[PDB]
């Protein structure tokens, strides 16, 4: 009995997790048998919040619910239709809990792009046909905040293709005030950003394919422009015209092209805005105070703090999140230290010249995230324990005595759990811990003051008993040392793995900037089929360019994508070959996104190591991928700065060297991210070079190739490919 392709694809072994939503400092909403229940952590009791029958009034069309902080009204979301990675339109209707009836008067319009409640109370703000509206109460008629909205040209409250994807990780660009006085939001102008057109074939019944278009900026092209406003919603009236107020950007960033990259209310009358230059090695933070007398927002340069980078770019993917103290007088942030390691730093609102910040943590390891901030303490995920970059543990530093640094999750189950996450309550009195590997995931309820386990939310005992009689793979997380530096790797070893045998090897690569494909988390996936059922070892290596091990490693591939990380993969495979248990004749490399680009570049290096490989949705040329991401690591593609390196690092130029390998190129026709064009060009270059390869398009699939039937088909197609490449 082995974990089969069928098992992966049909989800027979289900890895359960525990989703809860904190609604107060002692209570969370959890879902059970489709009923929303309310559990109080302070006592032991559970009540019923919303019964499944109320969802069933809309049959099975409900995709989500969302409750008002005060608990009087619920947004039932139905008719979800996806757009991009985060974006979608949906219809909403407000269920009034007290009354137990749908609010049928002045209803939320259909095709609504983004709706969210205020942080307190029950005020609504929505985005519809690109304009922001706001309802003070559910029954009241809506108030139109902006009217500049146009399809694909002007976006208010919602994000552009590239802002969504690359800076915010969300369709939302509107943020409510802490007590609901103001509604901050960003506006993006897309006039002049060139369009990526592609064919959409749809159903059999559609006689003529439809051309889909998106304003999408590529390396060097005309980017979008941004404007940040704030509007007062307490003065919302049909009698008086609503005036939004425009906070303008810093002088430092307005000189050339720039991005808005963070929005963070600190208090009622203060909001922080980080902006970033288009080069991305310089970033400015602007703390902006509200002047009540003349209703303008002022951003002093005494209040402007600048983080920059000489070694590469700012942040993992952008400047880190500001966590401000209760009085707004100081704030905490993950910033890069003297030796390159990113740690927590304490700033002040005012910017004394000599001193940027005070580093409260330090060492050869990185703070992954700041999780909560009390007056007494700060909680944070870090990878310090046991010098394992791909490990995560909860820590708690006391604001007063930084000597008082306590690791809350390190030794609870040291064998089962080396990768934790956490979700703390409104004022942090309680928290849920989620161990995500290397054992079966375990979610448990704890009290903050002294870590005492109050409950066990989910221990995956069901999956455990299902997997007890299955021959699963092992997982070796360890390292090899090249040039006096440790570069970690993970290997999904087959069941009953013996060092006296020679197994085939598959390298699963991503290898992008700030990537980590070797860590302690637990995954049931294609690799586990490949190890258990096929006896393929699947290894992944985090060489240069990988994150969480100091900037010296991460910025090592700066201005030079397709070089040091590409050869580091090739080198790793050599290092594993030296370990002796790998057959040199059967070594493979596969990957998706950046991984696909890396696999294509490794296959074309002429190294002689790798025999075959599969690129899925790959990048071929860096001038095709979007500006915000591409330019973060390469600069512009112009002679003034780095055009040669865009030219040096294309898959196309290495087509001659594909004559030594077996290549399987795959791409979805309706990919809006890494457009099909990129694979269309790789194929054209291989054909011109007289190279036989294999290919598979996927009609109407995006970057995910996520559709249930297409998903089953890609992984079955690739499995058969590897089956032939390794002679079974």
């Amino acid at each position, epitope marked *: 009995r082995t974990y089969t392709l069928a098992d992966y694809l049909k989800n027979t072994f289900r890895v359960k997790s525990y989703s809860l939503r904190w609604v107060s400092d002692s209570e969370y909403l959890y879902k059970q048998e489709n009923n929303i229940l309310l559990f109080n952590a302070e006592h032991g009791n559970s009540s019923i919040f919303l019964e499944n*029958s109320t969802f*069933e009034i809309f*049959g099975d*069309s409900i995709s989500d619910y969302s409750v008002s902080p005060d608990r009087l009204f619920v947004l039932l979301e139905y008719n979800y*239709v996806k757009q991009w990675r985060h974006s979608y339109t949906a219809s909403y209707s407000i269920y009034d809990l007290n009354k137990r009836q*749908l609010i049928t008067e002045e209803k939320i319009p259909n095709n609504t792009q983004w709706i969210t409640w205020s942080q307190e109370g029950h005020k609504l703000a929505y985005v519809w046909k690109n304009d922001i509206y706001v309802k003070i109460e559910p029954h009241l008629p809506s108030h139109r905040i902006t009217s500049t909205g146009k399809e694909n040209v002007i976006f208010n409250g919602i994000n552009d293709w590239v802002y969504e994807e690359e800076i915010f990780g969300a369709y939302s660009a509107l943020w409510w005030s802490p007590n609901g006085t103001f509604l901050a939001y960003a506006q993006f102008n897309d006039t002049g950003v060139p369009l990526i057109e592609y064919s959409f074939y749809s159903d059999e019944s559609l006689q003529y394919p439809k051309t889909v278009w998106i304003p999408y900026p590529k390396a060097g092209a005309v980017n979008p422009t941004v404007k940040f406003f704030i509007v007062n919603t307490d003065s919302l009236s049909s009698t008086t015209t609503t005036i939004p107020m425009q906070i303008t950007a810093p002088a430092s960033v307005t000189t050339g092209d720039h991005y808005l990259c963070d929005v963070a209310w600190v208090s009622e009358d203060r909001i922080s805005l980080q902006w970033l230059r288009r080069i991305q090695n310089y970033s400015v933070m602007a703390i902006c105070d509200y002047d009540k007398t003349t209703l303008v927002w002022n951003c002093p340069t005494t209040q402007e703090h600048i983080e920059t980078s000489a070694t590469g770019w700012c942040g993992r993917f952008r400047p880190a999140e500001p966590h401000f103290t209760s009085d707004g007088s100081s704030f905490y942030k993950i910033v890069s230290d003297k030796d390159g390691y990113k740690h927590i730093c304490q700033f002040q609102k005012d910017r004394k010249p000599e001193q940027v910040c005070t580093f409260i943590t330090k060492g050869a390891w990185e703070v992954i995230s700041i999780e909560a901030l009390t007056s007494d303490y700060l909680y944070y995920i870090s990878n310090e324990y046991k010098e394992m970059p791909g490990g995560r543990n909860l820590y708690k530093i006391q604001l007063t005595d930084h000597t008082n640094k306590k690791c809350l999750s390190c030794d609870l189950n040291p064998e089962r759990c080396q990768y934790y996450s956490v979700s703390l309550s409104k004022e942090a009195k309680y928290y849920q811990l989620g161990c995500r590997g290397p054992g079966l995931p375990l979610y448990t309820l704890h009290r903050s003051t002294d870590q005492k386990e109050l409950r066990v939310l989910e221990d995956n005992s069901a999956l455990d008993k299902m997997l007890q009689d299955v021959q699963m793979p092992s997982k070796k997380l360890d390292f090899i040392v090249l040039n006096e530096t440790r570069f970690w790797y993970q290997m999904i070893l087959p069941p009953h793995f013996d060092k006296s045998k020679k197994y085939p090897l598959l390298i699963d690569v991503y290898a992008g900037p700030c990537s980590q494909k070797a860590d302690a988390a637990f995954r049931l996936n294609w690799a586990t089929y490949l190890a258990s059922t096929e006896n393929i070892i699947v290894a992944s290596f985090d060489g240069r360019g990988s994150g969480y091990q100091g900037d010296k490693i991460m910025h090592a591939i700066n201005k030079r994508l397709g070089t040091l990380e590409v050869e580091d993969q090739i080198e790793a495979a050599r290092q594993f070959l030296k370990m002796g248990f790998v057959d040199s004749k059967r070594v493979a490399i596969w990957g998706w996104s950046y991984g696909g680009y890396v696999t294509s570049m490794v296959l074309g290096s002429g190294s002689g190591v790798f025999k075959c490989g599969i690129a899925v949705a790959p990048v071929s040329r860096w001038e095709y991928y979007d500006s915000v991401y591409t330019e973060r690591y390469m600069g512009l593609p112009t002679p003034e700065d780095n055009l040669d390196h865009y030219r040096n690092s294309t898959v196309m130029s290495r087509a001659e060297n594909f004559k030594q390998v077996e290549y399987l190129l795959i791409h979805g026709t309706a990919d809006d991210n890494v457009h099909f064009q990129q694979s269309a060009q790789i194929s054209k270059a291989l054909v011109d070079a007289g190279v036989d390869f294999q290919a598979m398009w996927y009609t109407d699939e995006d970057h995910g190739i996520a559709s249930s039937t297409a998903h089953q088909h890609i992984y079955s197609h690739m499995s058969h490919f590897l089956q032939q490449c390794f002679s079974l």
Partner: antibody
Amino acid sequence: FQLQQSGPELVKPGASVKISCKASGYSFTNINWMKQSNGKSLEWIGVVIPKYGTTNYNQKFQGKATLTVDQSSSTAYIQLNSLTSEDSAVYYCTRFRVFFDVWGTGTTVT
Amino acid sequence: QIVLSQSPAIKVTMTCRASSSVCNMHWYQQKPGSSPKPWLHGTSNLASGVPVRFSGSGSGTSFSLTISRVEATYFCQQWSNHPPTFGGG
């Protein structure tokens, strides 16, 4: 499980008629009505959740088909209002568990 | 607002094409004078009281109902989108 629907009724211009599903043999406590016109397909009117008074209706069956339930009596009531020629139809009741699990025998309102 | 259109109006096999993607499709068999009974749900599951010859298949817009080895007015309805809607017959 069976639902002995009320006998057929005759109605004329301007008037309002009430109809009873009379569910039995199952743990009552969702119920929906579909209007079927003769020679044509089925069309969904609305839903009542019998435990509470919670009602959801179709677009523009506001006014028509006021759906209310009082649990004590083993039944559900659909009041169609201001009937015209179009409102003359078969009107079934149903029980909703995953889809339309069981159906009432119909009233031929005229 | 979703429109189910059934091709044939006739192993005979009727189809349903939906105007948009439905998660699951339900089927109801009817005869003249008599209230309809549940025949198929969750795309392919045979409802109780229905002979084993019957099948269901297809995901997205194109669903299909396959009566194996036909022997002696089937409607198709969806509730993945609101409001719920029925096929012609």
